[PDB]
Amino acid sequence: GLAVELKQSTAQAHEKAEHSTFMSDLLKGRLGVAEFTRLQEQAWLFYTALEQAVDAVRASGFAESLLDPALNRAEVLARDLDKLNGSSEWRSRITASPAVIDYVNRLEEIRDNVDGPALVAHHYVRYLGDLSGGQVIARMMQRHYGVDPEALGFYHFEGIAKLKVYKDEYREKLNNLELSDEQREHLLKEATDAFVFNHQVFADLGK
Ligand code: HEM
């Protein structure tokens, strides 16, 4: 099934992400809320782009049931950032890191090409990760740095009750997508690239 092949083909990349110096240090308590806020600022940039691509692909009629708007993170992230930074001044201060420029550019290509299989790869890499492991990240930000849960809205998924069920249903939708061999290969390759972009975001944050 596609859900298994996605997980298997990116498992090593996921381990690599876990072991990133920046993200590792953040989750171990060695950094602080400032660095967490820098991460979330970069995330706002790439989630904004991702959600434009999701919107385009949803409108095309591809993977509709998968592309649940309840998953949208950009607006929630903006509210988190208003809290983390104390005002909305971050909007004019923030700049996309080189990593984020590449990631956003790719997302804009997917949006404008209305490339459904590529979009689904990106959707899986970000949202299933958020749904599945986000609670661990949120917990660590609360534990090590005292971040208020009200500033961790990104991790909450308002609108979803039974999360396990939601995850299982998400995987079933992946498995039920109609894809050619070319589309499936493209989707798998793109998921790998999605991990690569996300790792580099961490690498750039560390610099
Ligand atoms: C580059 C950043 C990361 C990305 C893109 C990402 C992506 C993903 C994805 C796509 C899944 C779903 C796997 C599947 O069930 O098919 C996932 C699960 C998960 N993630 Fe991440 N993840 C990242 C970083 C992390 C970090 C740093 C942690 C450390 C807390 C973490 C903890 C988990 C956990 C616990 C799961 C549930 C199961 C599993 O362990 O593999 N993730 N992540």
GROMACS .gro file of C-alpha atoms in nm, residues 44-114:
model
   71
   44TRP     CA    1   0.459   2.982   0.867
   45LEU     CA    2   0.634   3.066   0.540
   46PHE     CA    3   0.633   2.712   0.404
   47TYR     CA    4   0.287   2.618   0.535
   48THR     CA    5   0.149   2.932   0.369
   49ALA     CA    6   0.294   2.810   0.038
   50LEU     CA    7   0.194   2.451   0.097
   51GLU     CA    8  -0.166   2.555   0.166
   52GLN     CA    9  -0.184   2.749  -0.158
   53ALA     CA   10  -0.078   2.431  -0.340
   54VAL     CA   11  -0.325   2.223  -0.143
   55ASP     CA   12  -0.599   2.471  -0.238
   56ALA     CA   13  -0.510   2.448  -0.606
   57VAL     CA   14  -0.494   2.071  -0.609
   58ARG     CA   15  -0.815   2.032  -0.412
   59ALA     CA   16  -0.988   2.256  -0.666
   60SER     CA   17  -0.863   2.033  -0.951
   61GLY     CA   18  -1.051   1.734  -0.805
   62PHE     CA   19  -0.748   1.530  -0.702
   63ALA     CA   20  -0.726   1.366  -0.356
   64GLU     CA   21  -1.013   1.579  -0.226
   65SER     CA   22  -1.107   1.373   0.076
   66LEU     CA   23  -0.740   1.371   0.183
   67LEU     CA   24  -0.700   1.748   0.159
   68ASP     CA   25  -0.911   1.833   0.462
   69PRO     CA   26  -0.911   2.211   0.520
   70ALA     CA   27  -0.926   2.145   0.891
   71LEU     CA   28  -0.556   2.059   0.862
   72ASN     CA   29  -0.467   2.415   0.752
   73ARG     CA   30  -0.195   2.546   0.983
   74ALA     CA   31  -0.099   2.890   0.849
   75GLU     CA   32  -0.362   3.096   1.030
   76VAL     CA   33  -0.315   2.909   1.357
   77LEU     CA   34   0.062   2.951   1.325
   78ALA     CA   35   0.017   3.325   1.278
   79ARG     CA   36  -0.178   3.340   1.601
   80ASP     CA   37   0.094   3.136   1.777
   81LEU     CA   38   0.358   3.376   1.644
   82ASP     CA   39   0.159   3.681   1.762
   83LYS     CA   40   0.176   3.526   2.110
   84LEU     CA   41   0.537   3.409   2.093
   85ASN     CA   42   0.667   3.743   1.963
   86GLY     CA   43   0.426   3.967   2.157
   87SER     CA   44   0.284   4.145   1.854
   88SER     CA   45   0.236   4.100   1.483
   89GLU     CA   46   0.562   4.283   1.403
   90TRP     CA   47   0.723   3.950   1.301
   91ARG     CA   48   0.538   3.965   0.966
   92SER     CA   49   0.764   4.242   0.835
   93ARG     CA   50   1.078   4.128   1.010
   94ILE     CA   51   1.084   3.764   0.898
   95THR     CA   52   1.280   3.646   0.600
   96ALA     CA   53   1.281   3.307   0.436
   97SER     CA   54   1.600   3.113   0.491
   98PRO     CA   55   1.772   2.974   0.182
   99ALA     CA   56   1.617   2.639   0.268
  100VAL     CA   57   1.270   2.788   0.284
  101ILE     CA   58   1.320   2.971  -0.045
  102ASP     CA   59   1.383   2.639  -0.221
  103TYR     CA   60   1.098   2.466  -0.040
  104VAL     CA   61   0.849   2.746  -0.113
  105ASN     CA   62   0.965   2.767  -0.478
  106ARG     CA   63   0.894   2.397  -0.520
  107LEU     CA   64   0.557   2.433  -0.355
  108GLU     CA   65   0.474   2.723  -0.592
  109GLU     CA   66   0.573   2.503  -0.889
  110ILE     CA   67   0.342   2.229  -0.763
  111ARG     CA   68   0.065   2.487  -0.713
  112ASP     CA   69   0.100   2.640  -1.060
  113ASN     CA   70   0.140   2.301  -1.232
  114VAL     CA   71  -0.148   2.168  -1.022
   0.00000   0.00000   0.00000
